[PDB]
Coordinates of C-alpha atoms and ligand atoms in Angstrom, one line a residue:
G7 CA 23.2 -18.6 -7.7
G8 CA 22.6 -21.3 -5.2
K9 CA 19.5 -22.8 -3.8
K10 CA 17.5 -20.5 -1.7
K11 CA 16.1 -20.5 1.9
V12 CA 12.2 -20.4 1.6
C13 CA 9.8 -19.5 4.3
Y14 CA 6.2 -20.5 3.6
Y15 CA 3.1 -18.9 5.4
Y16 CA -0.1 -20.9 6.0
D17 CA -2.9 -20.9 8.5
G18 CA -5.0 -24.1 8.6
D19 CA -8.2 -22.1 9.1
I20 CA -7.9 -20.3 5.7
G21 CA -9.7 -23.1 3.8
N22 CA -12.8 -22.7 6.1
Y23 CA -13.8 -19.2 4.8
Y24 CA -16.6 -19.3 2.4
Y25 CA -17.6 -16.5 0.1
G26 CA -21.2 -17.9 -0.3
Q27 CA -23.2 -20.2 -2.6
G28 CA -22.2 -19.8 -6.3
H29 CA -19.2 -17.4 -5.6
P30 CA -16.3 -18.7 -7.7
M31 CA -13.6 -17.6 -5.1
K32 CA -12.9 -20.7 -3.0
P33 CA -10.3 -20.3 -0.1
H34 CA -10.4 -24.1 0.2
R35 CA -8.0 -24.1 -2.8
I36 CA -5.3 -22.9 -0.5
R37 CA -5.8 -25.9 1.8
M38 CA -5.8 -28.2 -1.2
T39 CA -2.5 -26.6 -2.3
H40 CA -1.0 -27.0 1.2
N41 CA -2.1 -30.7 1.5
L42 CA -0.8 -31.6 -1.9
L43 CA 2.7 -30.0 -1.3
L44 CA 2.9 -31.7 2.2
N45 CA 2.2 -35.0 0.5
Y46 CA 5.0 -34.3 -1.9
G47 CA 7.3 -33.9 1.1
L48 CA 8.1 -30.2 0.5
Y49 CA 7.8 -29.4 4.2
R50 CA 11.3 -31.1 4.6
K51 CA 12.9 -28.3 2.6
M52 CA 11.3 -25.1 3.8
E53 CA 10.3 -23.4 7.0
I54 CA 6.5 -23.3 7.5
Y55 CA 5.1 -20.4 9.6
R56 CA 1.6 -19.7 10.7
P57 CA 0.9 -16.0 9.9
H58 CA -0.3 -13.6 12.7
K59 CA -3.7 -11.9 12.2
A60 CA -2.8 -8.5 10.8
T61 CA -4.2 -5.7 13.0
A62 CA -6.3 -2.7 12.0
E63 CA -3.0 -0.6 12.7
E64 CA -1.1 -2.7 10.2
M65 CA -3.9 -2.3 7.6
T66 CA -4.2 1.4 8.0
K67 CA -0.6 1.8 6.8
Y68 CA -2.5 2.0 3.4
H69 CA -6.2 1.7 3.9
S70 CA -8.4 4.4 5.4
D71 CA -9.5 4.1 9.0
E72 CA -13.2 4.4 8.0
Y73 CA -12.9 1.5 5.5
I74 CA -11.0 -0.8 8.0
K75 CA -13.5 0.1 10.8
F76 CA -16.3 -1.0 8.4
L77 CA -14.6 -4.3 7.5
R78 CA -14.0 -5.1 11.2
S79 CA -17.7 -4.4 12.1
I80 CA -19.8 -5.7 9.1
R81 CA -21.4 -9.2 9.6
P82 CA -24.2 -11.2 7.8
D83 CA -26.4 -10.5 10.9
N84 CA -26.0 -6.6 10.9
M85 CA -25.9 -5.9 7.1
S86 CA -29.4 -4.2 7.2
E87 CA -27.9 -1.5 9.5
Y88 CA -25.0 -0.9 7.1
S89 CA -26.7 -0.6 3.6
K90 CA -25.3 2.8 2.8
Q91 CA -21.8 1.9 4.0
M92 CA -21.8 -1.3 1.9
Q93 CA -22.4 0.7 -1.2
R94 CA -19.7 3.4 -0.2
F95 CA -17.1 0.6 0.3
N96 CA -18.3 -1.6 -2.6
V97 CA -19.2 -4.5 -0.4
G98 CA -22.2 -6.9 -0.8
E99 CA -22.0 -8.3 -4.5
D100 CA -18.6 -9.4 -6.0
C101 CA -17.2 -8.7 -2.5
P102 CA -19.8 -10.3 -0.3
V103 CA -20.2 -10.1 3.5
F104 CA -19.4 -13.6 4.9
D105 CA -18.8 -15.1 8.3
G106 CA -15.2 -14.4 9.4
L107 CA -14.5 -11.8 6.5
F108 CA -12.3 -9.7 8.7
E109 CA -10.3 -12.7 10.0
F110 CA -9.8 -13.9 6.3
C111 CA -8.4 -10.4 5.6
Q112 CA -6.2 -10.6 8.7
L113 CA -4.7 -14.0 7.7
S114 CA -4.3 -13.2 4.0
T115 CA -2.5 -9.9 5.0
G116 CA -0.5 -11.3 7.9
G117 CA 1.2 -13.8 5.6
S118 CA 2.3 -11.2 3.2
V119 CA 3.5 -8.7 5.8
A120 CA 5.2 -11.4 7.8
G121 CA 7.0 -12.6 4.7
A122 CA 8.1 -9.0 3.9
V123 CA 9.5 -8.7 7.5
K124 CA 11.4 -11.9 7.1
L125 CA 12.9 -10.7 3.9
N126 CA 13.8 -7.3 5.4
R127 CA 15.6 -9.1 8.3
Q128 CA 17.6 -11.2 5.7
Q129 CA 16.3 -14.3 7.4
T130 CA 15.1 -15.8 4.1
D131 CA 15.7 -15.5 0.4
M132 CA 12.1 -16.2 -0.6
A133 CA 8.8 -15.9 1.3
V134 CA 5.6 -17.6 0.0
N135 CA 2.0 -16.6 0.9
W136 CA -0.5 -18.4 -1.3
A137 CA -3.4 -16.8 0.6
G138 CA -2.2 -13.4 -0.5
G139 CA -2.1 -11.5 -3.8
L140 CA -5.4 -9.6 -3.5
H141 CA -4.4 -7.0 -6.1
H142 CA -7.7 -5.2 -6.7
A143 CA -8.3 -3.9 -3.2
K144 CA -8.3 0.0 -3.0
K145 CA -7.5 2.5 -0.3
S146 CA -11.1 2.8 0.8
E147 CA -13.0 0.2 -1.3
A148 CA -13.3 -3.5 -1.9
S149 CA -13.0 -4.6 -5.5
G150 CA -13.1 -7.9 -7.5
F151 CA -13.4 -10.2 -4.4
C152 CA -10.5 -8.3 -2.7
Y153 CA -10.9 -6.3 0.6
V154 CA -7.5 -5.6 2.0
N155 CA -4.6 -5.1 -0.3
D156 CA -2.0 -7.4 1.3
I157 CA 0.4 -6.7 -1.6
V158 CA 0.5 -3.0 -1.1
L159 CA 1.0 -3.5 2.7
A160 CA 3.8 -6.0 2.0
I161 CA 5.4 -3.5 -0.4
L162 CA 5.2 -0.7 2.2
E163 CA 7.0 -3.0 4.7
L164 CA 9.7 -3.7 2.1
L165 CA 10.1 0.0 1.4
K166 CA 11.4 0.5 5.0
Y167 CA 14.6 -1.3 3.9
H168 CA 14.5 -1.2 0.1
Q169 CA 14.9 2.0 -2.0
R170 CA 13.3 0.3 -5.1
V171 CA 10.7 -2.5 -5.1
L172 CA 9.6 -4.3 -8.3
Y173 CA 6.1 -5.8 -8.4
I174 CA 5.2 -8.3 -11.1
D175 CA 1.7 -9.6 -11.7
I176 CA 0.9 -12.8 -13.8
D177 CA -2.7 -13.1 -12.7
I178 CA -5.0 -12.9 -15.8
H179 CA -6.4 -9.6 -14.4
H180 CA -4.7 -6.3 -14.2
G181 CA -3.1 -5.5 -10.8
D182 CA -5.0 -2.2 -10.6
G183 CA -5.0 -1.7 -6.9
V184 CA -1.2 -2.2 -6.6
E185 CA -0.6 0.1 -9.6
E186 CA -2.9 2.8 -8.2
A187 CA -1.2 2.8 -4.8
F188 CA 2.2 3.3 -6.3
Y189 CA 1.3 5.2 -9.5
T190 CA 3.0 8.5 -8.6
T191 CA 6.2 7.0 -7.0
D192 CA 9.4 5.8 -8.6
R193 CA 10.1 3.7 -5.5
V194 CA 7.8 0.9 -6.8
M195 CA 7.7 -0.2 -10.4
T196 CA 4.5 -2.2 -11.2
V197 CA 4.5 -4.7 -14.1
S198 CA 1.3 -6.4 -15.0
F199 CA 0.5 -8.9 -17.8
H200 CA -3.2 -9.4 -18.2
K201 CA -6.1 -9.9 -20.5
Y202 CA -7.3 -6.5 -21.8
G203 CA -10.6 -5.7 -23.6
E204 CA -14.1 -6.1 -22.2
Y205 CA -12.6 -7.7 -19.1
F206 CA -12.4 -6.9 -15.4
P207 CA -11.2 -4.4 -14.1
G208 CA -11.1 -2.5 -17.4
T209 CA -7.7 -0.9 -16.6
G210 CA -4.1 -1.7 -17.6
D211 CA -4.0 -0.1 -21.1
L212 CA -0.4 -0.1 -22.7
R213 CA -0.6 3.7 -22.4
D214 CA -1.0 3.8 -18.6
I215 CA 2.6 4.4 -17.6
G216 CA 2.4 6.2 -14.2
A217 CA 2.3 9.9 -13.3
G218 CA 4.5 12.5 -11.6
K219 CA 7.7 11.0 -10.2
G220 CA 6.1 7.6 -11.1
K221 CA 5.9 8.4 -14.9
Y222 CA 7.4 5.3 -16.7
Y223 CA 7.3 3.2 -13.4
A224 CA 3.9 1.5 -14.3
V225 CA 4.2 -1.1 -17.1
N226 CA 1.2 -2.9 -18.6
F227 CA 1.2 -5.7 -21.1
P228 CA -2.3 -6.1 -22.5
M229 CA -3.1 -9.5 -24.0
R230 CA -6.0 -11.2 -25.9
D231 CA -7.5 -14.6 -25.3
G232 CA -5.6 -17.9 -25.8
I233 CA -2.0 -16.9 -24.9
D234 CA 0.1 -20.0 -24.7
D235 CA 3.3 -21.0 -23.0
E236 CA 5.6 -20.2 -26.0
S237 CA 4.1 -16.8 -26.6
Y238 CA 4.1 -15.8 -22.9
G239 CA 7.6 -17.1 -22.4
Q240 CA 9.0 -15.1 -25.3
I241 CA 7.8 -11.8 -23.9
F242 CA 8.1 -12.4 -20.2
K243 CA 11.9 -13.0 -20.0
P244 CA 12.9 -10.1 -22.3
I245 CA 10.5 -7.6 -20.5
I246 CA 11.6 -8.6 -17.0
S247 CA 15.3 -8.7 -18.0
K248 CA 15.0 -5.1 -19.3
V249 CA 13.1 -4.0 -16.2
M250 CA 15.8 -5.5 -14.0
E251 CA 18.5 -3.7 -16.0
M252 CA 16.9 -0.3 -16.1
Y253 CA 15.2 -0.2 -12.6
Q254 CA 17.7 -2.3 -10.5
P255 CA 15.2 -3.1 -7.7
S256 CA 16.5 -4.6 -4.5
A257 CA 13.4 -6.7 -3.7
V258 CA 10.7 -8.3 -5.8
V259 CA 7.0 -9.2 -5.2
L260 CA 5.6 -11.7 -7.7
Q261 CA 1.8 -12.2 -7.7
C262 CA 1.3 -15.8 -9.1
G263 CA -2.5 -15.7 -9.8
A264 CA -3.4 -19.1 -11.4
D265 CA -6.5 -17.8 -13.4
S266 CA -4.0 -17.3 -16.3
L267 CA -3.9 -21.2 -16.6
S268 CA -5.6 -23.2 -19.4
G269 CA -9.0 -24.4 -18.3
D270 CA -9.6 -21.8 -15.7
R271 CA -13.4 -21.4 -15.0
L272 CA -13.1 -17.6 -15.4
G273 CA -10.0 -17.0 -17.5
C274 CA -9.4 -17.4 -21.2
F275 CA -5.6 -17.9 -21.3
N276 CA -4.0 -21.2 -22.3
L277 CA -0.9 -21.5 -20.1
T278 CA 0.2 -24.8 -18.6
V279 CA 1.6 -25.1 -15.0
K280 CA 5.1 -25.3 -16.6
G281 CA 4.5 -22.2 -18.6
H282 CA 3.2 -20.2 -15.6
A283 CA 6.0 -21.5 -13.4
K284 CA 8.6 -20.4 -16.0
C285 CA 7.8 -16.9 -14.7
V286 CA 8.9 -17.9 -11.2
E287 CA 12.1 -19.5 -12.6
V288 CA 12.9 -16.3 -14.6
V289 CA 12.4 -14.0 -11.5
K290 CA 14.4 -16.3 -9.3
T291 CA 17.5 -16.0 -11.6
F292 CA 18.0 -12.4 -10.5
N293 CA 18.8 -13.5 -7.0
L294 CA 16.9 -10.8 -5.3
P295 CA 14.8 -11.1 -2.1
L296 CA 11.5 -12.4 -3.4
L297 CA 7.9 -12.5 -2.0
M298 CA 5.7 -14.9 -3.9
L299 CA 2.0 -14.4 -3.5
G300 CA -1.1 -16.2 -4.6
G301 CA -4.0 -14.6 -6.6
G302 CA -6.9 -15.8 -8.7
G303 CA -7.7 -19.3 -10.0
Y304 CA -11.1 -20.9 -10.2
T305 CA -10.4 -24.5 -11.4
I306 CA -9.2 -25.4 -8.0
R307 CA -7.4 -28.7 -8.9
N308 CA -5.2 -26.7 -11.3
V309 CA -4.6 -24.0 -8.7
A310 CA -3.3 -26.7 -6.3
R311 CA -1.1 -28.1 -9.0
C312 CA 0.2 -24.7 -10.0
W313 CA 1.2 -23.4 -6.5
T314 CA 2.6 -26.9 -5.5
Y315 CA 4.8 -26.9 -8.6
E316 CA 5.8 -23.2 -8.0
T317 CA 6.7 -24.0 -4.3
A318 CA 8.9 -26.8 -5.7
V319 CA 10.5 -24.4 -8.3
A320 CA 11.2 -21.9 -5.4
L321 CA 13.0 -24.8 -3.6
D322 CA 14.8 -26.2 -6.8
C323 CA 13.2 -29.5 -5.9
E324 CA 12.2 -31.8 -8.7
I325 CA 8.9 -33.5 -8.0
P326 CA 7.2 -36.4 -9.9
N327 CA 4.4 -35.9 -12.3
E328 CA 2.5 -38.8 -10.6
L329 CA 0.5 -37.1 -7.8
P330 CA 1.0 -38.5 -4.3
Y331 CA -2.1 -39.6 -2.4
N332 CA -3.6 -36.7 -0.5
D333 CA -6.9 -35.6 1.2
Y334 CA -8.3 -34.3 -2.1
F335 CA -7.0 -37.0 -4.4
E336 CA -10.3 -37.4 -6.3
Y337 CA -10.2 -33.7 -7.4
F338 CA -7.2 -34.5 -9.6
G339 CA -9.0 -37.1 -11.8
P340 CA -9.2 -38.4 -14.3
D341 CA -5.4 -38.4 -14.8
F342 CA -4.0 -37.9 -11.2
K343 CA -0.9 -36.0 -12.7
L344 CA 0.7 -32.7 -11.6
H345 CA 1.1 -31.2 -15.1
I346 CA -1.7 -30.1 -17.4
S347 CA -2.2 -29.8 -21.2
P348 CA -3.1 -26.8 -23.1
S349 CA -6.5 -26.7 -24.8
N350 CA -7.0 -26.3 -28.6
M351 CA -8.2 -22.7 -28.2
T352 CA -7.0 -20.2 -30.7
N353 CA -4.2 -17.9 -29.6
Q354 CA -5.6 -14.4 -30.5
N355 CA -2.1 -12.9 -29.6
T356 CA -0.2 -13.1 -32.9
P357 CA 3.6 -13.2 -32.7
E358 CA 3.6 -9.7 -34.3
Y359 CA 1.2 -8.3 -31.7
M360 CA 3.5 -9.7 -29.0
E361 CA 6.7 -8.2 -30.5
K362 CA 5.0 -4.9 -31.2
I363 CA 3.7 -4.5 -27.6
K364 CA 7.1 -5.5 -26.3
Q365 CA 8.8 -2.9 -28.5
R366 CA 6.5 -0.2 -27.2
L367 CA 7.1 -1.1 -23.6
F368 CA 10.9 -1.1 -24.4
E369 CA 10.6 2.5 -25.7
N370 CA 9.1 3.4 -22.3
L371 CA 11.8 1.6 -20.3
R372 CA 14.4 3.8 -22.2
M373 CA 13.0 6.8 -20.4
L374 CA 14.3 5.5 -17.0
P375 CA 17.5 7.3 -15.8
Ligands
KRU401 O1 -9.9 -13.3 -10.6 C1 -10.3 -12.2 -10.3 C2 -9.4 -11.3 -9.4 C3 -9.6 -11.5 -7.9 C4 -8.2 -11.6 -7.3 C5 -8.2 -12.4 -6.0 C6 -7.2 -13.1 -5.6 C7 -7.2 -13.8 -4.4 C8 -8.3 -13.8 -3.6 C9 -9.3 -13.0 -3.9 C10 -9.3 -12.3 -5.1 C11 -7.4 -12.3 -8.4 N1 -7.9 -11.6 -9.7 N2 -11.5 -11.8 -10.6 C12 -12.0 -10.4 -10.2 C13 -13.4 -10.5 -10.8 C14 -14.3 -9.5 -10.8 C15 -15.6 -9.7 -11.3 C16 -15.8 -10.9 -12.0 C17 -14.8 -11.9 -12.0 C18 -13.6 -11.7 -11.4 C19 -12.4 -12.6 -11.3
CA402 CA1 -1.8 -9.6 -14.2
NA403 NA1 5.2 3.4 -9.4
ZN404 ZN1 -7.5 -12.7 -11.4

């Protein structure tokens, strides 16, 4: 279906935001990604834009005015004055107050909304925002290191021009904030694959299918530890194909959280970069306007590898396994290769479990008109 025009969103300041000592979320991984893909020469094939800072007006298309006013006002130096408000909005522990928190939100969000605008205007086929994908943020509360739900905001932008928008989430966590925003509408179908069972956020059971007009428009594929490329690949393509057939969206948002990779400091899946990127390849085959977003990922060398390779996939550009020299070269030792190996961990997702969950979701997809 041809090679695609790709617009890529990046602000060079993003890597300077720091969640605090010991916090596993490292915005610097976005800068490592960017530097790696520049050193592969991928800037020659795509348009690179610096996102605007999304305004409080843009954010309150979804989020409450009280919550956004709080995020814009809270700082490490006035936290004592806001103790009550911090608890109301779930800020101060997993979602710390840090210097430049609101600007981080603005840049994360600006990339996603700007990409959606570019898609709406038919000026690109794909838009990429690796600083986006903050799927846990809720209307009036922070959650799981997420403050502003850039994904929901981008989908609201797409809904100006698209009757039906499909959201797909391959982060190891359930995309609960996105699901919740659109749970009672048929104008967005949310599809999340995630680890389920004693695992954050605790949502995304098979049986959560939407409500009201949105009944059957939320799809959740709960998984166990140790899922591998072959097991994931054999459910992802059939599920997404059936979704595309039955729902017929006109735009797609794909959250590419890299915490579903093998060796992730917080995740317990066993995907390689190739296995993760196969999801991008599958979605790309439908030739629909596509917004590719970031997400989790805590082994930062593997995040940079993953999103570099997925940018190359978006561009249909073959890149060598030998990493080019770059500003973070030592982070890619001891091998200095792009691709990763799976671990020897047991896959707790038996082939029968995978088929059975698939069959249950197919029964739900038969309820669409
Ligand atoms: O990986 C996650 C969530 C965050 C989310 C994200 C993406 C991009 C930037 C900020 C945030 C990706 N998925 N986690 C939530 C959570 C909550 C509590 C203990 C560990 C974890 C890990
Ligand atoms: Ca997910
Ligand atoms: Na929905
Ligand atoms: Zn995650």
